[PDB]
A and B are shown apart, each in its own frame.
Chain A
Amino acid sequence: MLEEQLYLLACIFASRADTRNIKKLSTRLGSQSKYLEILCVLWPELDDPKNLLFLRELEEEVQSPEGEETTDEDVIVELLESDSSLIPLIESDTTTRSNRYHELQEFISKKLNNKTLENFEEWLRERILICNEMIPETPLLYSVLWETAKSKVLSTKFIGWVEGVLKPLDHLNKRLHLIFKINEWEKMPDSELFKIIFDGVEDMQGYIGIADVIEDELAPTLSYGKKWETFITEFFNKQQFSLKSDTNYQLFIKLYYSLEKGVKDNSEASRKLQSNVVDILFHN
């Protein structure tokens, strides 16, 4: 009985963005998973630039729960007394209340699409994902939430995913002012993904943007996707490199340098790129 009640309290507090109220309730659900879940999906997708490091800390430093052991019933009572408007929400009826609770959980699971939530990792990841559904261009939104991240609170997987997906997509968005969703970007087949990555790379009237996107976006993606060989197979070829223009020549040399620097342990990839370059220059 108390579980669904504190559950709906979590609902209403998250909906009203009451950090003060949701803080106490944080340790009251009995399973951190469901708490974090409702905390993620129901929370205002646009709540604040950060204003939420507190829940990160409630995830990080929970070792000595020496807070005021106010009885859950007291918590409910003082909460309803503080806010009469949600007394009707909490001082609910019979199983109809549980019906509301179950349909809310089903809505939560549906909006989640079968995403179990174990720790802050997928919490923040899925949060970034779902908020980018309306965020035009701000992959840096939750940066602060991971920039001051404590030790061993984020997996190197997440770090490399940011550095090799989030930072690259952010940089290219800022480069061409596009609204490429994170989901559609990782969704994006590498074929068209490279197609668009190498789209105006020849218009670049300078050596920074040429030797930048590759450094921070393309090469990190190839390393993360092991796409060193498939990329050079698909783009580092005579068709993409007609060598008609000095700009094409400079860009070709630059990419050769770049992925040559990248490919230093894959003998097959080095042979593939060498065949590629010698065929390119034999042909052009």
Chain B
Amino acid sequence: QFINYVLQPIRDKVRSTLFQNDLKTLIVLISQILATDKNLLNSFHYHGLGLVSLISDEVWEKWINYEVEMANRQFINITKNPEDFPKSSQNFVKLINKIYDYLEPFYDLDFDLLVRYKLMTCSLIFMNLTSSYLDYILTVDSLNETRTKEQELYQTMAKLQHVNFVYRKIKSLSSNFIFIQLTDIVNSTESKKYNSLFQNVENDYEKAMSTDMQNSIVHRIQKLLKETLRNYFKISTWSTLEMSVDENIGPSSVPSAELVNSINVLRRLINKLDSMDIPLAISLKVKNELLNVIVNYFTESILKLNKFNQNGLNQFLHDFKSLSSILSLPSHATNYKCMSLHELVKILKLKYDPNNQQFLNPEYIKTGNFTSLKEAYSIKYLKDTKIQDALYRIIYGNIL
């Protein structure tokens, strides 16, 4: 009571002489106020109403209005030109940091009538700036009018790296004790159980980066790939592919000449990918999807669409293995379609295994049960119809 009532005349003097003042001056004013409040916390302990009470709600509204104005201003200043792209995120963070640095002492106060304004600053600044930056980076083109597809990949992955760079900062903000207290209060202020502030901005980031740019990337990669798979698809020698019998080198240790270019392209592309900063999950997804589509292309446009000999399957498997090596699994992985292709090529290798020649009889074929066969290669991922297709292709001379 004593310290309250001795602050009272101080409050009177200042309020009579602070309600009209420069907002920029009001900044240093309120900072000195909260610094004296620190002082009266530690040095001369007092734990009642501070000088903040002088500032009328209208003054607080004018202040946060100037604040949101300066926020939007600095934002448009750092986001007005395309060349601002590659560093904006960082600066953006900095701005937020600055904003966080600027509001951190204001956030330090504990006065109740202002927690509302802390909500407003969280929404109309932090939520607002994050949403606006999300919209911008989502709808932005810092790239020249004339451009290449690889550049589209590049801007998408730089977008994604900006997404992750801002998203980790958003998560740190979420873990910030001030915003934590904000969320706890607002959950106790209304009937809500919100786990964060944004809860959508982060979700929008994740959805965009995991579906939109992910799928566009894999689509573009598939497109340029089929573009590079043009002549390799036209390879007809698979039938009459006589082994270059080299006693010193394994069978066809070098891939098809018409595919090495595609190999170098993919190598470059996935190299840019790996060198780019992505949440590992998305990289694994897109790499497995590229693996997936190349498995599909190989099994359909190559395997089923051509006759092969002993050396043909070896060459083709070698090509596939090189293409997959371009897409190295990170530390430890299998793949459904990879094991499927492996089962496939093992089946194809039945023609040149003159040991279990008993199963090539049409009546064990028509039997429909191939448990004995499936326990010869440990096949695990095939139906029975495709086995019939394979043995038909074998009997029909498609495999010499």
Give yes or no for direct A-B contact (beta carbon below 8 Å): no
B interface residues (Cβ-Cβ under 8 A, vs A): none
